[PDB]
């Protein structure tokens, strides 16, 4: 006879399939552990989610689950199993079981110099995974080093689809300084000026920032607050061109930009003196101020920097491309419904 597993004062109720737990860290809405899987005879990662009291937590849990269960791709984390109570009434927590990865790119960048061959391979795998995501008409919207998982042979998987959305470019426009959720350092400049982050170009900017960070082990645009992020971006890209300003029709955003003293572009080869010149050409194209001129994922894959890996026949797309007002009680039923396939029976 035996009760639920405990780890650091919290119930971590995954057994009897999952045993031999070790703490990893804190996730979004709960604890992250590794565990031995007695069926497949491997250690696995498990995240405990407790979203049911809040509609926003519910929405994000459901999004992640629905997207990750639909998606199947070598460069996208899957869901192996989901543990929850057998009834809606007894269900307080949801545990998501995923492949156990050695590390993530955030941790790796804090401790390891990357060879040019490693940067190339990591960038390739990011864009290969992103090709799939974008082909499903989905935007990840929070791409950053801690959302890129790596195994001991440097295979890379994109994780955390909690902020993802279906692309909606005809409703992308908004006013100046409109609040935004995704991680500050990886936000494209247009977020602060006139964009809701509903186009694919939002994700390309983030990947551009990740590439820059792989080159120097330091975030390229480490802003400390909302409009400081734009200060950092303009400080390297320089003042936007007249043509690029003309595409910002909103007057508050345009006039803000016009009010600033002239800033020169900082050449990439001066910021990154050891970088491969083809890597810097692709970086320039991913960190293009004007999101209409920014390179797309499939163009990025075809760039000469990635020529050793590029193979469109081995860069699959989604077979089946793809909640704001639904309250938390209905979202519980949808989460209960979406996780039913993992139950006994
Ligand atoms: Cl879904 C998932 C989450 N984390 C891991 N692993 C950790 C190991 C410690 O470094 C950070 C990543 N694997 C899978």
Domain boundaries, the chain: 1-100+325-345, 101-324
The single-letter DSSP state of residue 261 is P
Q: Which residues line ligand 1 (CB under 6 A)?
A: 24, 45, 77, 98, 100-101, 103-104, 107, 149, 159
Q: How far is the CA of 269 from the centre of ligand 1 (A)?
A: 34
* Ligand 1 atom at minimal distance to the Cα of residue 47: 1
Residue 81 main-chain phi, psi, to 5 deg: -160, 155
Q: Is 129 annotated as a binding residue?
A: no
For residue 211, the SS3 value is: helix
Q: Is 31 annotated as a binding residue?
A: yes
CB 338: neighbour CB atoms within 10 A? 16
Q: Is 26 annotated as a binding residue?
A: yes
- Backbone interruptions in the chain following residues (C to N > 2.5 Å): 322
Looking at CATH, the fold of the domain delimited by 101-324 is given as Transferase(Phosphotransferase); domain 1 (1.10.510)
Q: Is 30 annotated as a binding residue?
A: yes
Q: How far is the CA of 153 from the centre of ligand 1 (A)?
A: 15
Pair type for strands 103-104 and 148-150: antiparallel
* Residue with CA nearest ligand 1 atom 8: 103
Resolution, angstroms, 1 dp: 1.8
- Our mutation pick for probing the ligand 1 site, out of 76, 95, 100, counting the most ligand atoms within 8 A of Cβ, is 100
| Long-range contacts of the stretch 151-154 (C-beta < 8 A, 24+) | 151/101, 151/102, 152/102, 154/118, 154/121, 154/122
Round to whole Å and give the CA distance between 129 and 122. 11
* Residue with CA nearest ligand 1 atom 10: 103
Round to whole Å and give the CA distance between 158 and 286. 18
The two most distant CA atoms of the chain are separated, in Å, by 74
Output Rg (C-alpha) for the chain, integer angstroms.
Answer: 21
* Ligand 1 atom at minimal distance to the Cα of residue 159: 1
Residue 107 φ/ψ region, left for φ over 0, alpha for ψ in the -120 to 50 degree band, beta for the rest: alpha
- Our mutation pick for probing the ligand 1 site, out of 149, 150, 154, counting the most ligand atoms within 8 A of Cβ, is 149
Q: How far is the CA of 148 from the centre of ligand 1 (A)?
A: 9
Q: Is 345 annotated as a binding residue?
A: no
Looking at CATH, the fold of the domain delimited by 1-100+325-345 is given as Phosphorylase Kinase; domain 1 (3.30.200)
Q: How far is the CA of 103 from the centre of ligand 1 (A)?
A: 6
* Residue with CA nearest ligand 1 atom 7: 103
Distances in Å between the Cα of 179 and the Cα atoms of 147, 176, 194 are 22, 9, 11
Round to whole Å and give the CA distance between 65 and 85. 16
Q: Which residues pair with 42 in a beta bridge?
A: 37
Question: Residue 203: which of 160, 131, 141, 122 has the closest Cα?
Answer: 141
Round to whole Å and give the CA distance between 181 and 164. 11
142 is catalytic: yes
Round to whole Å and give the CA distance between 237 and 209. 13
Q: In what order do the strands lie in the sheet with 94-99?
A: 18-26, 31-37, 42-49, 94-99, 81-83
Q: How far is the CA of 204 from the centre of ligand 1 (A)?
A: 24
- Helical axes 277-286 vs 116-135, angle rounded to 10°: 30
Which position among 37, 142, 160, 203 bears the catalytic label?
142
CB 146: neighbour CB atoms within 10 A? 14
Q: How far is the CA of 302 from the centre of ligand 1 (A)?
A: 30
């Amino acid at each position: 006879g035996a009760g639920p597993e405990m780890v650091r004062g919290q119930v971590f109720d995954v057994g009897p399939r999952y045993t031999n737990l070790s703490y990893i860290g804190e996730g979004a809405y709960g604890m992250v552990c590794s565990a031995y899987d007695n069926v497949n005879k491997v250690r696995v990662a498990i995240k405990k989610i407790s979203p049911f009291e809040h509609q926003t937590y519910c929405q994000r849990t459901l999004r992640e689950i629905k997207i990750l269960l639909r998606f199947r791709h070598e460069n996208i984390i899957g869901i192996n199993d989901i543990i929850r109570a057998p009834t809606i009434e007894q269900m307080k927590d949801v545990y998501i079981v995923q492949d156990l990865m050695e590390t993530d790119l955030y941790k790796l960048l804090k401790t390891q110099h990357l060879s040019n061959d490693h940067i190339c391979y990591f960038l390739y795998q990011i864009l290969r995974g992103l090709k799939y995501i974008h082909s499903a008409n989905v935007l990840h919207r929070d791409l950053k080093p801690s959302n890129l998982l790596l195994n001991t042979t440097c295979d890379l998987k994109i994780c955390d689809f909690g902020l993802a959305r279906v692309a909606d470019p005809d409703h992308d426009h908004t006013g100046f300084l409109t609040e935004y959720v995704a991680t500050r350092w990886y936000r494209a400049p247009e977020i602060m000026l006139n964009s809701k982050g509903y186009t694919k170009s939002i994700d390309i900017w983030s990947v551009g920032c990740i590439l820059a960070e792989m080159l120097s082990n330091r975030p390229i645009f480490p802003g400390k607050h909302y409009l400081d992020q734009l200060n950092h971006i303009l400080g390297i890209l320089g003042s936007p061109s007249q043509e690029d300003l003309n595409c910002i029709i909103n007057l508050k955003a345009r006039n803000y930009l016009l009010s600033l003293p002239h800033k020169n572009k900082v050449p990439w080869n001066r910021l990154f003196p050891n970088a491969d010149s083809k890597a810097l050409d692709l970086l320039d194209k991913m960190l293009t101020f004007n999101p209409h001129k920014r390179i797309e994922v499939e163009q990025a894959l075809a760039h000469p920097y990635l020529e050793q890996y590029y193979d469109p026949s081995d860069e699959p797309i989604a077979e089946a491309p793809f909640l704001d007002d639904l309250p938390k009680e209905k979202l519980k039923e949808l989460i209960f419904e979406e996780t039913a396939r993992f139950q006994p029976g």
